[PDB]
Design an enzyme around this catalytic site. Structure first.
Site, PDB file in Angstrom:
ATOM      1  N   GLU D 162      -1.765-120.865  -1.463  1.00 37.67           N
ATOM      2  CA  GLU D 162      -0.611-120.053  -1.072  1.00 37.67           C
ATOM      3  C   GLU D 162      -0.527-118.716  -1.817  1.00 37.67           C
ATOM      4  O   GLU D 162       0.365-118.519  -2.644  1.00 37.67           O
ATOM      5  CB  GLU D 162       0.683-120.840  -1.301  1.00 37.67           C
ATOM      6  CG  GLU D 162       0.711-122.212  -0.645  1.00 37.67           C
ATOM      7  CD  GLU D 162       2.074-122.880  -0.739  1.00 37.67           C
ATOM      8  OE1 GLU D 162       3.094-122.189  -0.524  1.00 37.67           O
ATOM      9  OE2 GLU D 162       2.129-124.095  -1.033  1.00 37.67           O
ATOM     10  N   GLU D 350      -0.861-129.417   2.675  1.00 38.83           N
ATOM     11  CA  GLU D 350       0.479-129.840   2.235  1.00 38.83           C
ATOM     12  C   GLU D 350       1.444-130.006   3.406  1.00 38.83           C
ATOM     13  O   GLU D 350       1.635-129.084   4.200  1.00 38.83           O
ATOM     14  CB  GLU D 350       1.092-128.832   1.245  1.00 38.83           C
ATOM     15  CG  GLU D 350       0.392-128.684  -0.098  1.00 38.83           C
ATOM     16  CD  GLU D 350       1.156-127.797  -1.064  1.00 38.83           C
ATOM     17  OE1 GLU D 350       2.384-127.646  -0.894  1.00 38.83           O
ATOM     18  OE2 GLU D 350       0.527-127.242  -1.989  1.00 38.83           O
TER      19      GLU D 350
END
Lengths: 444, 446, 446, 445
Positions: D162, D350
C-alpha cells in the site's frame, strides 16, 4: 500532384476583413468595432470601416475569381447586418449575399458559406455575449434565416470558424474581440458556440430536411516536445489539449478531456455550464470535417506557468508572422486525426503566409510565398495517395485584408491591395496557382 | 532651476560583464551569463560579452574620459569569476587590476564606488545550486572579505547587490536573465539569500572589520499606478507593487516579508523554511545609505487570467526607444513614499538613463531626446532636496553604450557611442552637457 | 469577585428558528434551513425546527422566566419568512406577534434587543440566488423597513446581522450551514451583500428616518495563535486570523478588505467586480455599538497541502463537551487588540456560553461545569472594565436548550433544560446562580 | 461458493502491528515510533512497543496458523531489525525470521513475505526518507540481503504494501508515518517506492536468476458518482486517479496519468524526479498482482476543494470503521483490471472488517464479520467463473492488532486478544474459516 477529378480548389475571405461599408445597409457595430477602439489592442487603432470595400465592389472581385479558375469561393456572412437588433431581420444585407451566391454559380463557382467568423453583433455582447447561454438561441435564429434564404443556392455550410480563436484566444488571453481575460467566461463561451453548432446541424437536417453538406472548421496546430524528458512531454500534452483536444474530443468523441479540465480547475471551479443533453448534440454527425492549418508549435516545460508551458525557440525557417514553416508536421497532424478521431472527408478551409512584399513597377515578386503554398499542395497529393481523403484546399487569402490585431501591416492575400485607393492588383503568386488549376483540369 | 549643495556628487556607472571583456586572460572562468548568451533564443542574436567595450585593456584611457567629465564619482562593479574563478582559489592577478584602478582613480581626485555583486555569478557556484543553495551566503562573504581586505582603504563606498529583483525574479521566475530558470519557489529562495548575503556582509564589515567606509544595497524601484479607480485595479497595483518593490523593501527596512505576497506566491511556494531564525534581523541591519535605480513607472490593470492578477496597461506617455514611460512626476511620488513609509537614510540614485535610436552623422549623434530625459529627472532631484528628501547623489546610467543583457548591442543607453567593430569612443551632445552641468554647478561655488 | 458598573446590562439571548417552532402557523413559509434539514448527512439524524421550543405559543410563559433572571435586556431574532413569506407581501399577523412580545417585555421592565437576520433566509429568495444575488440587498431593506416603522419606538437596540461568517462562509464555502453550498466565489458575495445590507439598514434608520435607536452588527470572533515561533506558523496564524476575523473587521471599521486575504482567496476567486463604488463607504457607516459573539480561540499550524495553509493544532486546554477551547485569557487578548487597531465604540458581548453533557436527575440540574466557564468570563469582563475596555454589557447564550443547527438537539446551551417530549421548562442551577449574580449586583447598587 | 483446486486460503499480519520487542534484538526506532509520540496523531498515544508480543510468542502463533489449516501465512519484515544502522547488517534480527520461515515450512505452510510494510528506519527518515532518491538504493541493499538468505525458503515475495498509505496518507494528508503534509514530498516518495520495487524485482529476475514469484500489492477502492451529472463524474475521475490510476498506470502502463499530474500541479511544480529509465524499470514484468481491498468510496463534487471532492453520503450497510460493505462493487473492480490493465494472476492480499466485538464467557460471537468475509469470497468465486483468474486470498487479520492511528481500539483479527493477558482466543469465525478450508480440501476425489 495528380489530384482526383472531384478535388476542389478554392480561396477564402471573411466579411469584416474585406467588406467595409460598416454603417451602410442597416449594419450596426460588432464586437470588433468596439475592440478597435479599446486602447492597446490593435496596431495603431486600425479598423474595418472601409477594408477592401467589398460590399460595393463585389462584382469586380468575382471577375478576379473566375480567371484563377477556382472551383469554390469561401466567404462569411456578417451577423450584425442580418440581425442588427434582436429578432430584427434586415433584408438589404441578406439580399447582398443571395445575389452573390447566385452570381457565383452563374460564373460557375460553388459558394461555401461561413455562418460565424467572429463578427458578433454588439447587442449580443452587452447581454454577456457567448458567456450567456441565450447566445445559443440567438445564433440558431441567425443561422435559420440564412438556411431559409440560401440553402437552395449554397454548396456547403460552415457553422463556426476557429472557436479556439473566438473562445480561448478571445475570452482568455484577450488579444481578439471582445478582448476579455477570464478563463471561466472562456469555457462557457466555447461550450455555447459548440452547442449552437450542433443544434443548427440538427435543425437543418431533421426539421428543415436539407441534404446540403454541413460541418465545422477547427484550426489545429500540432505540438512538439523539445526533449524526451517527462517535463517536456507534459507541456506538449497541455499545449495539445489547449489548442486542439479541448475541441476535437467533444466534436468527435462527445466528451471533454479530463486532463485539461483538471488543469483549468485553477480558474474554473464549476462545470455546471454543461447541462444534460449537450455533448451528444455537440458531437452530432457531420458530412465533412473542416481544418484551418497554418503552422505547428514547439513547446517546453515551465515551472512558473499555470499551464506548465511557455513557447520554446525554433530554429526552423519562419514566415513574416514568425510562424514555423512545417509541411512535414502538417503530414503528421492528419494521420493522427484519422487514427484517433474521425474518418470523415477533410477540407483544408484555410492556408497561407505573410511576408514583407514590395511592389516594384506594378508587380510583386513573392517567390518566398510561392514556395510555402507549393510545399503544402505537394503534401495534399501525397496524403490523398495515403487515403486521407482530402477532397479540397482553400487558399487563405484571396485579398490582402484587415489582419485582426496586426491590422493592415500583414498581408495574407494572393491579391495585393493598396488600402489607400482600394485598387485590386493580381500578384505573382497567382501565376502558378492559376496555372495549377488549369493544369489539373487538363488531365481528364 | 536645478541647483545643488556643495557636497553633491555627480556620477556615472557601469557593470563588469557589460564592458570589460577579455574573458580568457587573468584567470577568469565563465560566468552564468557566458553560458546564457550561448543558449538559443534567450539573447538577441546570441550576442555575448567576449569583447564588449574592451574596457579591461583600455581602462587607463577610460579613466581620462572620467577625468575630463570632472565627475566626483565613478560607479563600477567587480567581476566575481576574476576573483574566485574556482571555489576557494584566490587569483591575485585579477585583484591587482581593480587595486590599480581604485588607486588611479584616487590619484585623479575621483571617488571609486564599487559594486560587489552585479549578477555575474561564477559557474562553479551555479553548478552547486547558486543563490538557491543556502551555502551561497557563505561563498559571497569569502568573496566580499578578500575585496574588503585589499580595497577598503582606497574605496569611498561599497554596494553589495545591484537590483536583486533582476538577479532574482526576472532571472529565476520569468527566465529572461541568467541562469534563465522559471520557478517561483526557486526565485524567492534566491532573493532571500541575496538579501541575507547583503546583510551578513554589512554586519561583517561594520562590526568585525570595524570599518566606516559607507556601505549599502541598491534596489530598483518602479511605482505602480491604477488605470481606473475600481477595486480590481487596486488589487492589481498592490500585487504589482509587491512583486517589484515591497518584497524587497519590507525585509530591508521592516525585517519582515509582506504576507500579501506570500499568500499570492503560495500558488507556487509551498514552504518558507528557507527563512531561518536570525535571518530577518540581519537583512534589516542599519546601513549608511540607500541606493535606488530608477528608470520609469509601470501602469497596470487587473487580469482574471493572470496568476498574480495583473498585466501591463496601455500608456499614453511619451516613450523611450525601449518603450519605457517618461515619468519624472511619478518618480517624485516614489521618493516621497520611501521617506514616509520606510527610511530616512540618505538616498543615492545609482542608476538613471535611457536608450534611444542613435544615428551617427558627421561624427555626431544629436540625442536631444536623451538630454531632455536626463534633464527632467535631475530637475526633479533638485526639487525633492528642497523638500528635505536628502538625495545626496546621482549616477548617470550609462557612461558607454554597452551589452544591454537580453537586448544585446541593439539598444544604446550610453552617453558615449561605441563602434564595437573598432572600439572607437565618441563624445557627443550631452556628457559635455553633463560636464557642463557639473561645471555650472561648480562655478557658482567658491 | 466581579463588580460591574451600574449602567452595565445583563442579558440572555435566542434566535427565532432555534426556539419559535410553529413552522406552518401564522403564514410562515419554509426557510433555507427547512430545506437544509431534509438533505442527507448535513444535520444530525435529520432533526429540524418544526416544533423546537414551541415558543410561538408559550411566549407568554417564557417572559416570566426572563423577568425572574432580573436581566436588563433580552435578545431575540425575527424570522424573515414570517414577515415576508412571499416577495413584497407583508404579513401583519407574523409581525403582530413580535410587537406584542416586545411590548410585554417593556411592561415587565425588560429591554428588548432585536436581531433582524439570524440565518433564516426565506426559500423564495434562495431560489432566485439568495445572498449571492445583489437584489438581496434590496430584499433586506424591505424586510428591515417594515420592522423599523412598527417597532423602533419600543426597542432599545437593533442588531442588523448575527455572525455573517456563519451565514456566509460556513453556509456558502464549507457547506455546513444553510443553504449548504461549497463555493468560495459565491461565499465572498454573500458576505459582501450581508455587510452591505447592514450598512444600508443603518443608513436608512438614521438618515432618512432620522432615528436615534442604538444600532450595530454582531460578529463572532475567534483569536488565533501560532503553534510554534517559526515563520511558517506565523503565516498560518495571519491567514487563519484573516479568514475568521479581519475579513469582517477591516470592512466594518476601515472600509476595506485585507489584500493579503484577497490574494490567498484568488485561488478560487478571480474577480472582485462585485465590489462596486460606494459599497465600502456604506459598510463602514458609523454604529452606536459593536457586538461580539465569543466562544473560543483557535490554535493553528502550517499546512503545505492546505489551500489556506492551515490546520488545527493539538490543545492542552480544559475542554467543553463540543471540543472548543476554554480560553478566558485569550478572550481578554481579543478585546485589547480591538481598542488598539480598530474601534473605540462601546463593546457588547452579544453571545457567550457553553455546552456540556447535562443529565436531569431528581428534578434539578447541577451543572457546575457550565458555571465555571461563565464565571471565568464574567470576572474577566469586570477586569477588562477596570482596564478601561468599556464593555457596557454581556449576553449569556442561551436561555433555553434549543436546535443547535447541524448538531440538532444533542447539544445543550441553555440555562434552562428542555424535555422535548413534554416541552416543559425546568430551571438549572446556573439560571438561579446567574439570576443571583445579577441580584447581588443590583443589591450592591444603591 | 466454488474455488479452483489449487486455490490458496490464507491469513496475514505486519511486523510493527504484532511483533513488539521494540528495544530487543538490536531494533532501532522507526518513523512509526516517533509518530505515535506526536500529540493528537494516534488514539491516546498508543504504540507498538508491546503489541501482540509476537516476537516472543512466535511459536504459539505458528500453531494457531497450522490449526486453521491455511495454505499460506503472509507476514512483513521489520527493516530496523535487519538494518538497525546504515550499511550494517544485523544477523541476530534475521535469525528471528529464519526460524519462523523454517517452522512454517515444517508445518506445511507456505510463507508469503512482505519486504516493506511502512516501518522505515529513523536513519533513513532523517536523511529525507522516501523523499530522497537514495532511498531506492537503501531498499535494494535491504532487499538483497533478504533474497540471498531467504529466497530459498519463501513461497512468495511482496516488495511494497500500500504505497498509497506510506506515500499519500503519510506525506500528503498526515495520518500515517512520518506524518508530513507536502504533496511534493508525497509524489517524490511514491515514485521512489515504486522505483525501488522495480529495481528489486529486476535484481531477483536478472542477476540472481530466481523464479520465486514476486509482485506488488496495491490497495484499490473503486469510485462511484452520486449522480449522473457531468460535475459528479469529474469528482469521481479525480478520486479514482488519486487512489488507483496514480499507482496502476506506472506499474502496468509505464506512465503517470496526465490528468492527475495537472490536478496535482497546484502543489507539484516540477517532475525532474522522474529520471530516464525509471518508468521503464517500474513496469518490469511480475509473477502476480497483489490487491488489498476493503471498501468503495462514493464521492460527489465540491467547488471549494482543490481536488474537487469531499466524499458523498452512503446509505449502504456499514462496518464499525464506518466503511461501506460493498462486495458487488468489488466484482466491477476486478473486471476493470482485466479489461484495461493486466492479465496477471490476482491475489487478494488483504480483506476483512472491524466490528464491536463483545467478549462473553470465553466467546465473542462475530456472525457479522462472517457475513462480510463470506459475501466477498462468493464474489471471489463468481469472478473465477468469468475467468478473472483470482488464484488466492489472504484474510486480514490473523489476530487483533495495533490498527495504526486508531490504536488498539479497533480489531480486524479473527483471533481475539486480551492485551493484559496476551491470550489468543479463537472465535467460531476462526473455526468457520478453518472449516471452509476443510470443506474445500474435502471435496477432492
Amino acid at each position: 500532384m495528380h489530384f482526383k477529378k472531384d478535388f476542389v480548389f478554392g480561396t477564402a475571405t471573411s466579411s469584416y476583413q474585406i467588406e467595409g461599408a460598416h454603417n451602410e445597409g442597416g449594419r450596426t457595430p460588432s464586437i470588433w468595432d468596439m475592440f478597435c477602439d479599446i486602447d492597446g489592442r490593435v496596431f495603431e487603432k486600425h479598423n474595418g470601416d472601409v477594408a477592401c470595400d467589398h460590399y460595393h465592389r463585389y462584382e469586380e472581385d468575382i471577375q478576379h475569381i473566375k480567371k484563377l479558375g477556382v472551383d469554390t469561393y469561401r466567404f462569411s456572412i456578417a451577423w450584425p447586418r442580418i440581425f442588427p437588433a434582436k429578432g430584427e431581420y434586415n433584408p438589404e444585407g441578406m439580399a447582398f449575399y443571395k445575389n452573390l451566391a447566385l452570381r457565383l454559380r452563374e460564373e460557375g463557382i460553388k459558394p461555401a458559406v461561413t455562418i460565424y467568423h467572429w463578427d458578433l453583433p454588439m447587442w449580443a455582447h452587452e447581454e454577456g455575449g457567448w458567456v450567456n447561454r441565450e447566445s445559443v438561441d440567438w445564433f440558431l435564429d441567425y443561422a435559420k434565416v440564412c438556411f431559409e434564404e440560401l440553402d437552395d443556392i449554397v454548396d456547403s455550410w460552415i457553422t463556426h470558424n476557429e472557436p479556439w480563436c473566438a473562445g480561448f484566444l478571445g475570452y482568455h488571453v484577450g488579444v481578439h474581440a471582445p478582448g476579455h481575460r477570464d478563463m471561466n467566461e472562456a469555457v462557457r463561451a466555447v461550450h455555447h458556440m459548440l452547442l449552437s453548432h450542433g443544434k443548427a446541424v440538427e435543425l437543418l437536417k431533421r426539421e428543415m430536411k436539407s441534404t446540403t453538406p454541413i460541418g465545422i472548421t477547427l484550426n489545429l496546430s500540432p505540438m512538439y516536445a523539445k526533449t524526451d524528458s517527462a517535463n517536456d512531454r507534459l507541456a506538449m500534452n497541455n499545449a495539445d489539449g489547449y489548442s486542439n483536444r479541448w475541441f476535437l474530443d467533444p466534436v468527435f468523441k462527445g466528451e471533454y478531456p479530463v486532463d485539461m479540465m483538471n488543469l483549468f480547475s485553477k480558474y474554473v471551479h464549476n462545470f455546471d455550464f454543461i447541462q444534460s443533453g449537450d455533448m451528444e448534440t455537440i458531437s452530432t454527425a457531420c458530412d465533412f470535417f473542416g481544418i484551418n492549418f497554418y503552422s505547428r508549435g514547439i513547446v517546453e516545460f515551465n515551472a512558473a506557468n499555470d499551464f506548465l508551458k511557455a513557447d520554446a525557440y525554433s530554429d526552423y525557417e519562419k514566415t513574416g508572422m514568425g510562424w514555423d514553416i512545417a509541411p512535414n508536421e502538417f503530414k503528421d497532424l492528419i494521420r493522427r486525426l484519422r487514427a484517433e478521431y474521425t474518418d470523415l472527408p477533410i477540407y483544408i478551409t484555410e492556408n497561407g503566409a505573410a511576408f514583407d512584399d514590395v511592389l516594384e513597377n506594378g508587380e510583386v515578386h513573392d517567390d518566398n510565398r510561392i514556395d510555402y503554398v507549393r510545399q503544402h499542395l505537394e503534401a495534399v497529393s501525397d496524403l490523398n495517395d495515403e487515403g486521407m481523403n482530402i477532397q479540397g484546399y482553400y487558399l487563405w487569402s484571396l485579398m490582402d485584408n484587415f489582419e485582426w490585431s496586426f491590422g493592415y501591416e500583414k498581408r495574407f492575400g494572393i491579391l495585393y491591395i493598396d488600402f489607400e485607393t482600394q485598387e485590386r492588383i493580381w500578384k505573382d503568386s497567382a501565376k502558378w496557382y492559376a496555372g495549377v488549376i488549369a493544369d489539373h483540369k487538363a488531365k481528364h
